[PDB]
Amino acid sequence: FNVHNRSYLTLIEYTPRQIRYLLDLSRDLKRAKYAGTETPRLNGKNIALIFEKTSTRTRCAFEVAAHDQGAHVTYIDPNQIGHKESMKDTARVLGRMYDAIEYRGFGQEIVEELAKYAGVPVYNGLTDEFHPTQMLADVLTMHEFSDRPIHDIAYCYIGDAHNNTGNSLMIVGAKLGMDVRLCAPRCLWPHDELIEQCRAIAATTGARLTLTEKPEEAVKGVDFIYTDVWVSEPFEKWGARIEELLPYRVNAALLAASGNPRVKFMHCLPAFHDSNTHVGKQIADQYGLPNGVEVTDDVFESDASIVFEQAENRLHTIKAILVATLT
Amino acid sequence: FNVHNRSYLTLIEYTPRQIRYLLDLSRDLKRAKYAGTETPRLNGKNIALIFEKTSTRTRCAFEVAAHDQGAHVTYIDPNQIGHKESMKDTARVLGRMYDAIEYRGFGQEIVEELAKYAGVPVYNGLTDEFHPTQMLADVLTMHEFSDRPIHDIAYCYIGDAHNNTGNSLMIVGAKLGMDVRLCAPRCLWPHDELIEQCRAIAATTGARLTLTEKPEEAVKGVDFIYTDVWVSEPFEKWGARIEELLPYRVNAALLAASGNPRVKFMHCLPAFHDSNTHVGKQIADQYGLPNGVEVTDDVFESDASIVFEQAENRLHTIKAILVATLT
Amino acid sequence: FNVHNRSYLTLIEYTPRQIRYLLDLSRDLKRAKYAGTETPRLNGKNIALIFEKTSTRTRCAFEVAAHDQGAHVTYIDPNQIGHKESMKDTARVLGRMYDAIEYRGFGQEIVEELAKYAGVPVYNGLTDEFHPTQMLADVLTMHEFSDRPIHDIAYCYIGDAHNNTGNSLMIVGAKLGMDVRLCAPRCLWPHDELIEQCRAIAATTGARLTLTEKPEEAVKGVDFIYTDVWVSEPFEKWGARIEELLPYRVNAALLAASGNPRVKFMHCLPAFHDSNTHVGKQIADQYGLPNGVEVTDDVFESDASIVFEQAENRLHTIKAILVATLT
Amino acid sequence: FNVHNRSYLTLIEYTPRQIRYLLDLSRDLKRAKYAGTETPRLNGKNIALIFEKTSTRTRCAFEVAAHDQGAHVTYIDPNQIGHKESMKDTARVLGRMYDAIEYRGFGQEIVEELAKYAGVPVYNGLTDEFHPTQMLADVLTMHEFSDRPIHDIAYCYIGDAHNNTGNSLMIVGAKLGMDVRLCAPRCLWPHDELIEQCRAIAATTGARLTLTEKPEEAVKGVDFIYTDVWVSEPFEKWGARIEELLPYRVNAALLAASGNPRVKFMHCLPAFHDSNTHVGKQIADQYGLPNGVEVTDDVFESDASIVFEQAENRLHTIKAILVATLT
Amino acid sequence: FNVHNRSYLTLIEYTPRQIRYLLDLSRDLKRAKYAGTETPRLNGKNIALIFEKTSTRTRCAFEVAAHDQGAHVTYIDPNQIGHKESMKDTARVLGRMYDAIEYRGFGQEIVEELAKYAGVPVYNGLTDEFHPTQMLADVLTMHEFSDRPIHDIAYCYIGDAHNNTGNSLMIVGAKLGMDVRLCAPRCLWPHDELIEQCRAIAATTGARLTLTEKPEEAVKGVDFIYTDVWVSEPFEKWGARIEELLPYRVNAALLAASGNPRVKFMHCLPAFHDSNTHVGKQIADQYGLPNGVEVTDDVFESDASIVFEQAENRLHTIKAILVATLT
Amino acid sequence: FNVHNRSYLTLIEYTPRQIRYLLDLSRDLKRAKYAGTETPRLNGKNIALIFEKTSTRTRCAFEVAAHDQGAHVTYIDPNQIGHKESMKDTARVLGRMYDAIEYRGFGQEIVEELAKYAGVPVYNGLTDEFHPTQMLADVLTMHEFSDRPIHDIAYCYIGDAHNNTGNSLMIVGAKLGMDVRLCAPRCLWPHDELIEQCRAIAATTGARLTLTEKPEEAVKGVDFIYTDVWVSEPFEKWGARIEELLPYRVNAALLAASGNPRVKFMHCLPAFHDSNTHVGKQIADQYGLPNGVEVTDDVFESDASIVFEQAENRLHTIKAILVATLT
Ligand SMILES: [Cl-]
Ligand SMILES: [Cl-]
Ligand SMILES: [Cl-]
Ligand SMILES: [Cl-]
Numbered sequence A, B, C, D, E, F: 001f002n003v004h005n006r007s008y009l010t011l012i013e014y015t016p017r018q019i020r021y022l023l024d025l026s027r028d029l030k031r032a033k034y035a036g037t038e039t040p041r042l043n044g045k046n047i048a049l050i051f052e053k054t055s056t057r058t059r060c061a062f063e064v065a066a067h068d069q070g071a072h073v074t075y076i077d078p079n080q081i082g083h084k085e086s087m088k089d090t091a092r093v094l095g096r097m098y099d100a101i102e103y104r105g106f107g108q109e110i111v112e113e114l115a116k117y118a119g120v121p122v123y124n125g126l127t128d129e130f131h132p133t134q135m136l137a138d139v140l141t142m143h144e145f146s147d148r149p150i151h152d153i154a155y156c157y158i159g160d161a162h163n164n165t166g167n168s169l170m171i172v173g174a175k176l177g178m179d180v181r182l183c184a185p186r187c188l189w190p191h192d193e194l195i196e197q198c199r200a201i202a203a204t205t206g207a208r209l210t211l212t213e214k215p216e217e218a219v220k221g222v223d224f225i226y227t228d229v230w231v232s233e234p235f236e237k238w239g240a241r242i243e244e245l246l247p248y249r250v251n252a253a254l255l256a257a258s259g260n261p262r263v264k265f266m267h268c269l270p271a272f273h274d275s276n277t278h279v280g281k282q283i284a285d286q287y288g289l290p291n292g293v294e295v296t297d298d299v300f301e302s303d304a305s306i307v308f309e310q311a312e313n314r315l316h317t318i319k320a321i322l323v324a325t326l327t
């Protein structure tokens, strides 16, 4: 019962042993779903889903995972917590009605208060600082597409690194002993406090945390290249960060710069890889990036891309979290 | 397995044999629900419901039908696909999480791309061009209220005919060999390309497709008179189309003009038949139509009206679609 | 089958015998949920939930209660009935698809029309005049925290008394013979018509209905003190009613004025007891009430407060309503 | 839930839409029993059966129908309600123990009081005025043996027409729009009050109610000829009514007088068609009618007779009533 | 297993501890039936029901209780044990076929012989001396309508006290320590032998057994007033006992004589409270008691009357007896 | 399927092979009931029980056997077939409602007509000529109390031999090859036609049928002595037959006359063995037979008596008949 009745706010609060137990559980549940061996063990359990920010992958992953294990789910639309009722008051009411709460919002303060007073497991769909449910899916995808042990895998996240995606990517790789590389301008590196935490963790696990501004050096010898949108947010901010992050675009030459023909590409999504989105065409017109913003359409649709296999693993990893905490 | 694992985008892609198989299935499932013989055969199946346009009849029909067969359902509120994430990207993620997708939106292009990349059955709740789920419910209702074969039934749709409702009403009647009549100004006839497709279909099935501008001639000898709202859309457009469609109002004299005392009245809904709706009173005040816009309150509430029996059959027909494609 | 197949619009339409049957049923279902003896008896039943006003306690109570008894539920977001489709038309469509309807909106006229034409049980989550689902939870909470019979319990609601919360609190206490006290300015007393109805009811049950403007006299000898927000509504109205209701604030001295060390405090929620809500800080800044608007933070968080036990009983009482009307 | 939780006292209180829903339900349940698709949906439900008059068809139909749907049944033998305990008192005790009551007795007053105070659905096995459970079976039998719509069917009841059998036969045919003919002496016509009710109903449904004294005119063009025993009752009354009803005997010439070789014969039973019953031989000896009283043995045993198919449909129609009111 | 495999002939053979265990069990089973938590634990068990005297409440209570716990039941109509076959012989045959026997007859000798030789539990529906199944229902009803402990409850039975109803009412109250009062002429007091048994029992339990001829003194301070019919029996005997029992009629003044506004009224039933019964009008005509014999119609139908809640508790108490002896 | 879908009217229509198959089946079902291995295989099957004559053993045996195999049963009280409705008409209605019919009446003609027209298996509880269900129980009892093969068993029936009990006892023993002896006055021997049938059967099976008037010779060497009541019937007939049957009384000396200390005694019941029955005392008073009519109380209650084990086997043998014909 190491993970029994535990909240899932960030992987910092988890040991490597526990993280790899959740990766193994996600593997077995994914296989059980395909093979038909899956048996529901959360029958009649209700899970509230706070979603102050919109979501497609995380919401659906929670709903289907829940239904596969016999649980029900209540989806709370953004259409306003903290406006008429405090987070502390809301936590103490949902905790007496629901067996678990998921929270997709703004501050780690908010979800930490939710966990403090809820009295039931609380999960972090995404905050401004961390995004741990995504990290479980990412490592599972890398393991599936890797012939080697998890601690021998190397990967480079490139782009806005001080956002929640880069923060948790640093944590997970340091936890599991793998070779992590964050590549970005020093303006967009994670806060030095968090970097220092992960340097200490890497000492105890053999992980190789490196932060650099030079892309061609960050991708050399990696198995996977990772990127995310450069803005979470007003349109005007795009102009500022496009100047900073222009050399960090993920194109065919970048994957070639790794020197690894087996290298794959990952993206937590949503992604701007073409001009077939409303805001995507707004960036392509004013700033002249028609065939992708942070990744080329070619790279995104190439055989090296595994972004959709990564997206599907959100279902199985979140399902593992539900089973490990409620059973 | 003629209909096994098939998308339902429009009835053009369906043979008459398949359409009547779905009508028969809707009849048996409707009877099984009342009699208690219904047995769930979609247990644990998840269905995503894209709803970019609001809906009461279609959403509820999907939810209850799904729950009656043991399936679950995720309702995606309008509150924005195509804004941050492309339809192609969304299709490839939901297709790995859900057993089927429903789409209620704008363009047949959108739902056709959804079907192309989803990898799972995709259903069309409504597009701007077609509305095939409604057509199945309409024909089932006519068959129930008809003592004669489906190919002997006659019906006239009157009003805005180039919208999705008139388009699919032309298709279904041509498929099933029945006597179809669209009555409207030539400004509001369906595009000649679609008319010509249905003329060709009617040749092979014995259907009698006729398009006319004269109401008293379109209703003579029909078993059912059909109408829909004249605007889908800004308020200002009402003034233009009210002038065009004023003589096409459905009143007691019109049903009398059919010459059939057994004639019934149908409406896909929502309908403006009185001044008890917010926009309905706005039309009644400025344009002076207090007792109904496209149909009189008397006609709508008369014993000849079967609009609510038609609405209920949405549950059973959609249920037939779910069973025939997922089983 | 006294309560079989009955709508739940207000407790005026219910006898004391029936109300206490629902309180007893809520007690047994609450105990059955904890003890594991609960057995689902609403399997496959669908319940539509109209929510024109936002809700946390009522929506979740319906969802979880429904799922505990094996029923499904469709949550209709505010994002507009009565705009394009009348309430009468909507009732006749949902009544053929759903086994029951809940309505959370504005006027008793709206939910009464829903019950008239739906053909299935209709429940009142909240209207402007009544809020009967809350009343069942309140009396259950008082009974649990009372060593004495229900008809011997005394309680005082203080604040805006002509709102839906004070109206139904008058009704329920008069029905059950208990000592009821509404304390407010005469401007904010319930309409004299409703007061006179409850005076007549109190004659037949032994209830002691008293309405007063003096707080220290209304709380003397009561077991529970009750309060609610002073505005449902624009911000500007707060200034007017804060002047009226300033002496009716619930502070430590008020509970002391009861003279009962066992006295408890209740609140239907949401509540403004601190400056940790968006609108709550707006009131605290302009009007200078930092530690609570209608109740002190101390009182709200004191051991005397039972507001969260009251909130949880919404699940069990609503569950009792579902079982008693659908079984 | 049009028929949910409703008593079944006479078809006057039922709309045509509801009656045809019960005919459809009887058809589906009859087919489900043969095909094996029937699934019990009344498990654990108890039904009391008041039988102040003896019964074979109605009692057994209730018992087997109940057992097929998983319900139990308590048969109260004639061996005396209203002797030591009032009907009102009995209703309020059985209503708290049983989910439904059936009543086979004397006056519509008795069963109407039972329904008033029972609090649960009450069914009328037979009263002196009406016999609605039989009517459902009769129309189902006619529909099965008719190639044409129900409203096009013609039938003639001949014999004692002011009894319960003729009364309800007038009601049902008027409800369903069919061509009804009662043939009897004016002494034995139904009360003019009831005739006038059914004339008004026939106006709104297209039914053709005709009452005549001439047999050869009443049977011309009918699909079914119906008859019943001429006395319910002392033996002495037979002499009086045999003189009146002698020309109304159902013999081979009468069916020939219809002019329809497809014509069938119906009888609610019990029937005196031979001298193989104790009272049947008493009539045959004194009054000299050896080969049948109201119908010839030849006609009763001819291929045109469908009285036993009619008797079997009592099971399926009563079963439909149980399902439609208790589910 | 204190009550396991035990016959239920009279409460004299039961300790107070066992009686209150059966009252508690009846409470839990009554609540389990309403709440849906009831689970059958007598599946496939057969219970023979000897009924030499007619019965409505006891027969139905046995049938429905049995069916609720999954047992079956065989109802033996009065239409003669002891005529061709002895009770001893019958007991030894039914004991090898049935899991339990109920007996409703004449002498305690008969049911005691049944228990002696049956080899299975035997229950006493009613004898001339005792009626213990009724007593369990009566005490349960008093407890439900009492805010105080069972041993503090006071009640007065008034009328024919030496019948089976008064005899067992004396026993049960003495067993449970409550304040019992039998009020009747000394001609109709129970036999002194039984009175002396209950005086001895009352010594060990604190019960206050008092027998008096003065009504106004017997009702002072009681919570419940109880009465029964004055004859079980020829019509001629009514004249004799009406003279004796005229001052013991239960009217509004009598309940007022208790001095307790909370006082309730009870009656095992059947009751003569109006002229709407065959024998009831015979008494009203000859003896001039039109508005009730032993209780006024006003009192019987007043809010103080709880006779029907008492009747319903026959189901739950008998059910408790079945469960406690067969499980 | 030798016995599949077959009526059971008399054992004459059954081969020895089939009879011993039913004896074996009764043995296995009796053992399965005690051991808990019994599994219901008649679920949902309805069995009508015509009982024109009263019955305790046969009715209960049918009810409990039916319920043990999951079947239901409808008990038709004597309170008149053949009075208003012919047997042929009744058979054709019950055959379409019930899976089987039992008949307990007067003439083999009646039950043979029932089987002819019913269309479903018909069983003979008892007629005036035969009583085959009893015979199966009798042989099973003899086999259980016999260490030797069935064809080596010897038994003597003594008393009124031309009744149904003696008739079928002759048939069964002749079928199974056992040594049968009927002992009675020649006035009360079975009809010579039936005797001659059984002599022919005994030739083919080795049975030893002997009819004698001398008791001491009929009992010599038998394993079982059998007797039944001397009148089925007015009281006056007893005087006539008591004179005839006085020397045929079953007393201790008679069992001694067999010369077999292991000899047992059997009686189909009801039996007059003492003065503890209403009619039994009438015979004892007028005719002076206080300690038994056809058997002494001593013999009936002696250890040699096995009448109650014989009675219990009615359940298991009838159960075998139900299983062998309906499965
Ligand atoms: Cl490129
Ligand atoms: Cl009009
Ligand atoms: Cl304070
Ligand atoms: Cl003829």
Ligand SMILES: [Cl-]
Pocket (backbone or CB within 6 Å): E251, E252, E253, E296, E298, E299
């Ligand atoms: Cl009075």
Ligand SMILES: [Cl-]
Pocket (backbone or CB within 6 Å): F251, F252, F253, F296, F298, F299
């Ligand atoms: Cl002897």
